[PDB]
Amino acid sequence: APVLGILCGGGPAPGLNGVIAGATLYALRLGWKVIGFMEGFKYLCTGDVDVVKAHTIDLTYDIVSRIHFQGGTIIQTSRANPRKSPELQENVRKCLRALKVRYFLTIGGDDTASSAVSVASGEISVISCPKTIDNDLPLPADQSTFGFHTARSLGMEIIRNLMVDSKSAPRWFLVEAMGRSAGHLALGMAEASGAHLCLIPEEFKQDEIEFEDVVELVEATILKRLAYGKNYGVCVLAEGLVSKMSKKALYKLFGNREPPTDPHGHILLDDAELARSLSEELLKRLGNLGIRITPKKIGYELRCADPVAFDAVYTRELGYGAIDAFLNGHSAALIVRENGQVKPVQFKDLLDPATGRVRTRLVDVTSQSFKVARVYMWRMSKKDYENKDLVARVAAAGKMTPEAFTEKFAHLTDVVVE
Amino acid sequence: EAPVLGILCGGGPAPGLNGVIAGATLYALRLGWKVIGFMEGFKYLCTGDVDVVKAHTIDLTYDIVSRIHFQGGTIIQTSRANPRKSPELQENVRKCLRALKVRYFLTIGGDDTASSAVSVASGMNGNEISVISCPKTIDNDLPLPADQSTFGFHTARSLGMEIIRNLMVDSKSAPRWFLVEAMGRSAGHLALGMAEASGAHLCLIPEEFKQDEIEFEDVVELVEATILKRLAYGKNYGVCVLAEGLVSKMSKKALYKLFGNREPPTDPHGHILLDDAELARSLSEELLKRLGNLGIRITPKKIGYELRCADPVAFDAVYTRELGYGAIDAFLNGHSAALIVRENGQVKPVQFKDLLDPATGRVRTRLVDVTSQSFKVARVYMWRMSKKDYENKDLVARVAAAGKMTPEAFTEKFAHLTDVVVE
Amino acid sequence: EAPVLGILCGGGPAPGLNGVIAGATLYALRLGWKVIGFMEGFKYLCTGDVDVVKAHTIDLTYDIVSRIHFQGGTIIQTSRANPRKSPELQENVRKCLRALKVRYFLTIGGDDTASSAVSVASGMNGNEISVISCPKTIDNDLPLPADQSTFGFHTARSLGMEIIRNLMVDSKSAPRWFLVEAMGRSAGHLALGMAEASGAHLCLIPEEFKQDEIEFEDVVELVEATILKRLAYGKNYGVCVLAEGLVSKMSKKALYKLFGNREPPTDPHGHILLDDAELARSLSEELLKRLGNLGIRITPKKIGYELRCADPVAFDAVYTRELGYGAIDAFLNGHSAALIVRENGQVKPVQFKDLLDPATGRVRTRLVDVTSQSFKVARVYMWRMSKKDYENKDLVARVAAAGKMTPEAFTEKFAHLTDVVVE
Amino acid sequence: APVLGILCGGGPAPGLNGVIAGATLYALRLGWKVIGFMEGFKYLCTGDVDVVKAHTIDLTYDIVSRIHFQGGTIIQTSRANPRKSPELQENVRKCLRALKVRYFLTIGGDDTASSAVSVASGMNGNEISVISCPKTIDNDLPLPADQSTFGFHTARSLGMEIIRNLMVDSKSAPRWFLVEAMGRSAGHLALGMAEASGAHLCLIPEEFKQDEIEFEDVVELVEATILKRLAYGKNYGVCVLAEGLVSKMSKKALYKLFGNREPPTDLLDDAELARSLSEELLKRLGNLGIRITPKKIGYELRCADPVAFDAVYTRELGYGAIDAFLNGHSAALIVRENGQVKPVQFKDLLDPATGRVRTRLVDVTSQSFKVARVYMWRMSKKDYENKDLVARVAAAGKMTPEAFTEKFAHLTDVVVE
Numbered sequence A: 001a002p003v004l005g006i007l008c009g010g011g012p013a014p015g016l017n018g019v020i021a022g023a024t025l026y027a028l029r030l031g032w033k034v035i036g037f038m039e040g041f042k043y044l045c046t047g048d049v050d051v052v053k054a055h056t057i058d059l060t061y062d063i064v065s066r067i068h069f070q071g072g073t074i075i076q077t078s079r080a081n082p083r084k085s086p087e088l089q090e091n092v093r094k095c096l097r098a099l100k101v102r103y104f105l106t107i108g109g110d111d112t113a114s115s116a117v118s119v120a121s122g123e124i125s126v127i128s129c130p131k132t133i134d135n136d137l138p139l140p141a142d143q144s145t146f147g148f149h150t151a152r153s154l155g156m157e158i159i160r161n162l163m164v165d166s167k168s169a170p171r172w173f174l175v176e177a178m179g180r181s182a183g184h185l186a187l188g189m190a191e192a193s194g195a196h197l198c199l200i201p202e203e204f205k206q207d208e209i210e211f212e213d214v215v216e217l218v219e220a221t222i223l224k225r226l227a228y229g230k231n232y233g234v235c236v237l238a239e240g241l242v243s244k245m246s247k248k249a250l251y252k253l254f255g256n257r258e259p260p261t262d263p264h265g266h267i268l269l270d271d272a273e274l275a276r277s278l279s280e281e282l283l284k285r286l287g288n289l290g291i292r293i294t295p296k297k298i299g300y301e302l303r304c305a306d307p308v309a310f311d312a313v314y315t316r317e318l319g320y321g322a323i324d325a326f327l328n329g330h331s332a333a334l335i336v337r338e339n340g341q342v343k344p345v346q347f348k349d350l351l352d353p354a355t356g357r358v359r360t361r362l363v364d365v366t367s368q369s370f371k372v373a374r375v376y377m378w379r380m381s382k383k384d385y386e387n388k389d390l391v392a393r394v395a396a397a398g399k400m401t402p403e404a405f406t407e408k409f410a411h412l413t414d415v416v417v418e
Numbered sequence B, C: 001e002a003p004v005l006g007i008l009c010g011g012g013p014a015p016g017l018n019g020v021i022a023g024a025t026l027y028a029l030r031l032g033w034k035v036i037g038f039m040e041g042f043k044y045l046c047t048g049d050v051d052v053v054k055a056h057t058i059d060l061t062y063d064i065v066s067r068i069h070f071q072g073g074t075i076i077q078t079s080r081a082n083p084r085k086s087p088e089l090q091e092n093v094r095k096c097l098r099a100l101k102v103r104y105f106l107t108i109g110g111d112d113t114a115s116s117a118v119s120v121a122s123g124m125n126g127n128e129i130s131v132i133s134c135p136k137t138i139d140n141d142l143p144l145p146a147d148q149s150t151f152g153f154h155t156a157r158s159l160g161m162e163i164i165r166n167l168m169v170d171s172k173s174a175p176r177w178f179l180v181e182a183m184g185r186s187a188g189h190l191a192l193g194m195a196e197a198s199g200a201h202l203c204l205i206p207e208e209f210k211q212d213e214i215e216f217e218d219v220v221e222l223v224e225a226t227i228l229k230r231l232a233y234g235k236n237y238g239v240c241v242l243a244e245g246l247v248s249k250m251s252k253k254a255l256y257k258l259f260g261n262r263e264p265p266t267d268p269h270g271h272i273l274l275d276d277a278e279l280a281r282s283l284s285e286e287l288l289k290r291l292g293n294l295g296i297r298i299t300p301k302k303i304g305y306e307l308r309c310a311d312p313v314a315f316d317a318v319y320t321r322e323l324g325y326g327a328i329d330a331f332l333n334g335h336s337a338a339l340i341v342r343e344n345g346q347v348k349p350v351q352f353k354d355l356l357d358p359a360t361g362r363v364r365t366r367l368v369d370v371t372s373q374s375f376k377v378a379r380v381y382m383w384r385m386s387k388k389d390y391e392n393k394d395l396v397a398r399v400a401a402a403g404k405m406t407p408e409a410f411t412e413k414f415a416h417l418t419d420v421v422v423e
Numbered sequence D: 001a002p003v004l005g006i007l008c009g010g011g012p013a014p015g016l017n018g019v020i021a022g023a024t025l026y027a028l029r030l031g032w033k034v035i036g037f038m039e040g041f042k043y044l045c046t047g048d049v050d051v052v053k054a055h056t057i058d059l060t061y062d063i064v065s066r067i068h069f070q071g072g073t074i075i076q077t078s079r080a081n082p083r084k085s086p087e088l089q090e091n092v093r094k095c096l097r098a099l100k101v102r103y104f105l106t107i108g109g110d111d112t113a114s115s116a117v118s119v120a121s122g123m124n125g126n127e128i129s130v131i132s133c134p135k136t137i138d139n140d141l142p143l144p145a146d147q148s149t150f151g152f153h154t155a156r157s158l159g160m161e162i163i164r165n166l167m168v169d170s171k172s173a174p175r176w177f178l179v180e181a182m183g184r185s186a187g188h189l190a191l192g193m194a195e196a197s198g199a200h201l202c203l204i205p206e207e208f209k210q211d212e213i214e215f216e217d218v219v220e221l222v223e224a225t226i227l228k229r230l231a232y233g234k235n236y237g238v239c240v241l242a243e244g245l246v247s248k249m250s251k252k253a254l255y256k257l258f259g260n261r262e263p264p265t266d267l268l269d270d271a272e273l274a275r276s277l278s279e280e281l282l283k284r285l286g287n288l289g290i291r292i293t294p295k296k297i298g299y300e301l302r303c304a305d306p307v308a309f310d311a312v313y314t315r316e317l318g319y320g321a322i323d324a325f326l327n328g329h330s331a332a333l334i335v336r337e338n339g340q341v342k343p344v345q346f347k348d349l350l351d352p353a354t355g356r357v358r359t360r361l362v363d364v365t366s367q368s369f370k371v372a373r374v375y376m377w378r379m380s381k382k383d384y385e386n387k388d389l390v391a392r393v394a395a396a397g398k399m400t401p402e403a404f405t406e407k408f409a410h411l412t413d414v415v416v417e
């Protein structure tokens, strides 16, 4: 019988088990043998077939019949990446040939998909399922990556508790939403929860963000709320703001120190604490006004939540579509769903010609959806800065003259799209 | 004086009603409008007494709505009071709207609500009042582009998945079959959504039956075939979800058996009272007679009103926010006698005529597309006997053995089901 | 060879069974013990066939139990199979336990499960096998100390509170009365727990009725008086919680009316089939006749099986972890024929015979203490007519007018209810 | 009719609205007029009756009839404290007399109760009667053992759910999470979450024998657990740390905690216990393939909707506060003991050494604490004497058995066993 091998790569997302169960159950009805590689490509990269065998399990009906209820992944995951070295690429092929895998399904994000194709270019069929809580794969605009609905809904619930706490005990929370690729998750939680402000890298006009601009954008929102009798709120910040910051901005971000670096010289953005740094600066400027500021991260607690019904149906249909692609002879394709139809889409169609890697889908800040979400935020627009009565009220809330306020804040209209 | 926006809700509640109310109100307050809300839909506007209406209208202020997007239900309540039947009531509604100087009138409800709003507007000048309605249904039965949901449906489906999950664990921990009856007779979107998400072993919706009228025996045998096939694989437990809409497709003879071989209950006007029907209960009793000897236990369970006012999930909070905004945008752009709908990621007004089915005079009913790939995928992960299964002599031998009958008897009784439901 | 601990579950499932199983297994594994679990309680141990028992026993390993403390249900399932009625079955259980060389035998279940365990032990040498039982019930009807709840009760009550919360929002958003029927016929602990937490406008439990037999009319009138009093304050909606145990206290005449003026159903051996009774449904039908004209709509709703396998709340996660440890502690300390209970924050074994009520021979049943401060406080936040309320003529006039009847007529019909339930 | 005034002080806890609704609904049935002061004592301290009126609301049946479902407090809360100045105390006295408050209910912590009694001690006992309801999510009131403060049950169960997701994520993507449970008073909340979720280790200040904790000891305690699980093939886990560990640390330990810098001063809030431990442990164990990430579980618990246990608890408390007033009680705290809500004079609950209500901490000698410790991964005294176990654990850390015993064995004298 043909052998289907399944692995997960990247960060976990709710519904991984849904894909594994959808593909495996259907594959078992066809008589296929199904196996699962533990921790993604980590052991397939070694090239040692003995080690790989110690880290594969037989995916049986009893194993998968009820994992569609469960967050996380029963075969675990890793970011082990064979595409970096041709030596590692041949190791992955050597172990797959040794195990006589006829069909190879990888469940992961953009990094995982690019890894799959390198193994595929040289019998064996390679298909990948789109996974990310950041929603940054190049799916059709009216289509989400699986795990995003679950992550967004749980993020909304957490932010609701912070909204009740901020009003009950007046305070501002700076929530730092995990994910640096795009702002889909940060904007999603903020819009659903009615958060008073959301900042994503996609809305900054210039290529490089300055630390002062970010501080002042949050400051303007806090003051305008203060002019309307509200000394509390919630502000959501995409962690991706850090990856757009200039060299100078990162220096201030890390405490006016040199940014930490890995052995190769790349900055270590994980050590950055965007929300905590902004909270300290803002307390210095606004504490006297009766404002309290506390940072809060909404990250890893979203990744392995049990899937919501939308992701349960999505991943069941995706797992089926992966098997159907195998039966119909497809290879080097991504299973995507558009207009209620799961279809394979060749890898090449999704590559960005400039990069050679899977294209990254960001928030379209020109869309109607972004404009409606922006309406329900507290912020100063171009028209607001031109309203002399409004500028007077806000400036007074910040205990500064209107001329001082316009000098400091009016330039932000050229920093972010309006 | 600032323009007055009046908002009411009609029909049954759906999660996210407060989302529409807050979305419309908050944007309107930023424009300087005065916003008021009628309690219980048209109930008091039908009286025509302006004294009574004011006692049951409230000022929808920033403080009232700034945080109702978290909450299920509707803070201005709802009713099915329907003025369209009488112009005495319609003119009473007109008299109160004019007294309160309502410039913009937003109704959130089903067709009965939408039709009432347009009828009240037709006997009014277009300059004086502009009328917009937002279509609401938890049944997902509006004619949106395929695989695009009505607001409130996602929340109802996800909560239904959670309830069925607890029943799936309970059926396995203490072997038993649950017949879950999903509320709603319009369509089978909700029953199928819960079933697919929870991995339920069977779902029956009226949309999959080929013939125009369903027979009570066939429904029993379709569930019976699933229970036997599961029993033949060592599983004497499961969960089967039944859309309540099965009752509305049943023949006269089928309804006679459904109500205990009695005459179906009737209202004063003579129309059948299908609400008194207990589909899951009757099927459970009959199946216990046939399968009790095999060690099978069967219990019914309804999943209804606990879904209607659950707090909205993030998808519905965003959905209703865009709808509330889009209605105000429609008012600003001069639209009236229009329905605020979201299609292809865009909230737009849609004239009533485009959505009406001429046969009924009400909005067309979108049912489950049983030819769609989604329905076929859902059917794959169910336990059932297909055309190919009945031709498999080895499989038929095991299932018949589980039912303590010969293979010939089983094929004779059940094989005809392949002509009853699409395959 | 290491000693063998064998575990089974009996009775109905309750949240935290996996918690007890994981507590006992993990600690037992650290001691070097071998742990096995019998599937479906006593079902296969009663056969006496060691081949059948082995086909339905599993090895409880670290990987199997390391994280089941999060999960509702039981990984080894449960059953109500009861060997205690027959010595033939008791000896069969002994034969299979000796064959599997069970040194320690832990049963997790209710009264019947504990009683079966002791009977199996009386004909067994105290040096070969030691038997311990862990008390489980969602009905909270075991005779634990008054300051202690049974495990699973906290989870069932909190989820029950949430479901009723959605019904409270739905009843107010769309004016209606829900008659919620709380599962469990032993006592009213679960119904009163859900009602008080959710602010339900009324709770009726068997424990509050003075007379030994309840009358169907009295139940209808108690709900009728509440609906009218609420109506006298402008509220035509609410939620009323009914312990299913009301049915098991009803007289013969009351049961005849309960089953539709039909003969009550009976099983083959003569036991009335109270499961088939639908208390909330029947009360709704009668109340709609009397109160429909007033604009009152009534709908029943059952809150049953969806609570039994919910994931445990933290209180039950800690409780069942301490119980599983406490069962292992009892085994190590030479205890047998004892039940592991927690009192004043201390887990200790308590001999089964010490917990028996000498008048009956069974474990005493703890019901709601209606004289306690807790019950009086719960009654305060209900809508009802007290003794003094019936004497307040201003109030009685307002309520009677809401009911379309004279004040004298109201007193005639309802005033006697102060002699039906404790005040 | 008599006037009952209610205010909230301190940090919010789930069920605050439950107390407000219990007291208000019962008082309305008695015919009382009920008002609520916004943000605790903040505006009563000014003494301006015009300002206070702008920040008091009429607590009516419609306002409170359904707030028992809701987290937070509808009248908000503050830490404004009039007891510090006799000038502020008059101001509170002047505004309460102006509003003709007969009954005064304060819902808050120890500071809130002390303010209420202080305002009452210099006021005629006939005009005003004062009761306080003790609130804390830290479970540190001196109730009978194994009896909780309201809000603790809700906070613990939601914290369990958060940790569960981290437990799945740590296993799905091998990693260690150092969760820092908010609260410096005690370890009730950290240990409650840890036991319920099956977390592999929990550290509370109460388990350290010496009076001052050393930063090195904390690192090594977490290090030993990571190695012992690693010796059983598991390079992942979750460890819960009570924030109270920092307030027990020595001066030298705090110096290392803040990055070998001078600790900030007016400041334990600025300390990042979980983050600092994460950095040090990565230095020592990163080479072994271990990743460590901190996570704080704080403010998201404070205003969660109450669980059923807290909804009943706060309803019974609100009833008891009204019952105490009717029976003439004043300068008393409404507490529940043996399932009975009754008033207890504030002075009866004070520990003479401090002048504030006594603090109940985790009893590490109790059976409950030992059972929780059993299901943790750690090296006991007996474990260090098991040569086979020490050899495997040391090998997992790529160090000799002698080196492992040299570095870690002394920890059995650092924490109770």
Ligand SMILES: Nc1ncnc2c1ncn2[C@@H]1O[C@H](COP(=O)(O)O)[C@@H](O)[C@H]1O
Pocket: A228, A375, A376, A377, A378, A379, A380, B029, B030, B031, B032, B062
């Ligand atoms: N930036 C903003 N975002 C959302 N609402 C706002 C904003 N600024 C003012 N509002 C609200 O808009 C309404 C009208 O404000 P105004 O134009 O100042 O009278 C009030 O309800 C304000 O709270």
Ligand SMILES: Nc1ncnc2c1ncn2[C@@H]1O[C@H](COP(=O)(O)O)[C@@H](O)[C@H]1O
Pocket: A028, A029, A030, A031, A061, B229, B233, B380, B381, B382, B383, B384, B385
């Ligand atoms: N009706 C069904 N729906 C879903 N899975 C099934 C069904 N019938 C059999 N299976 C599974 O399909 C696989 C192959 O079955 P078989 O045809 O007996 O080899 C096994 O894992 C069965 O449990």
Ligand SMILES: Nc1ncnc2c1ncn2[C@@H]1O[C@H](COP(=O)(O)O)[C@@H](O)[C@H]1O
Pocket: C233, C380, C381, C382, C383, C384, C385, D028, D029, D030, D031, D061
């Ligand atoms: N049976 C009841 N349970 C709870 N609250 C009530 C009840 N009856 C009246 N109330 C409330 O008690 C307050 C005073 O009642 P009354 O003095 O009768 O108007 C009002 O808020 C009523 O809604």
Ligand SMILES: Nc1ncnc2c1ncn2[C@@H]1O[C@H](COP(=O)(O)O)[C@@H](O)[C@H]1O
Pocket: C029, C030, C031, C032, C062, D228, D232, D374, D375, D376, D377, D378, D379
């Ligand atoms: N520190 C610990 N905490 C909890 N369980 C443990 C610990 N150490 C060992 N175990 C478990 O105890 C059982 C017996 O261990 P061993 O004595 O090493 O065979 C196995 O299930 C281990 O995983």
Ligand SMILES: O=P(O)(O)OC[C@H]1O[C@](O)(COP(=O)(O)O)[C@@H](O)[C@@H]1O
Pocket: A009, A010, A011, A012, A013, A109, A131, A132, A133, A134, A178, A179, A180, A303, D173
């Ligand atoms: O697993 P790590 O290395 O700690 O990184 C977490 C990152 O993974 C994510 O959770 C999602 O990972 P993917 O991009 O692979 O879906 C991001 O939000 C986050 O930046």
Ligand SMILES: O=P(O)(O)OC[C@H]1O[C@](O)(COP(=O)(O)O)[C@@H](O)[C@@H]1O
Pocket: B011, B012, B013, B014, B109, B110, B136, B137, B138, B139, B183, B184, B185, B308, C174
């Ligand atoms: O409110 P009623 O009269 O009891 O009717 C219940 C109906 O409301 C619903 O739950 C939802 O109604 P809507 O489509 O108007 O949202 C239906 O499923 C059901 O038919």
Ligand SMILES: O=P(O)(O)OC[C@H]1O[C@](O)(COP(=O)(O)O)[C@@H](O)[C@@H]1O
Pocket: B174, C011, C012, C013, C014, C110, C136, C137, C138, C139, C183, C184, C185, C308
């Ligand atoms: O398993 P069955 O026969 O459906 O019985 C359901 C009964 O079990 C329970 O859920 C609990 O039963 P136990 O007391 O044995 O735990 C009751 O509430 C209910 O009456």
Ligand SMILES: O=P(O)(O)OC[C@H]1O[C@](O)(COP(=O)(O)O)[C@@H](O)[C@@H]1O
Pocket: A169, D009, D010, D011, D012, D013, D108, D109, D135, D136, D137, D138, D182, D183, D184, D302
């Ligand atoms: O409100 P702050 O100043 O940010 O401090 C939060 C503190 O309040 C609490 O949530 C509890 O407050 P109380 O002690 O008043 O009950 C602690 O857990 C926490 O240390």
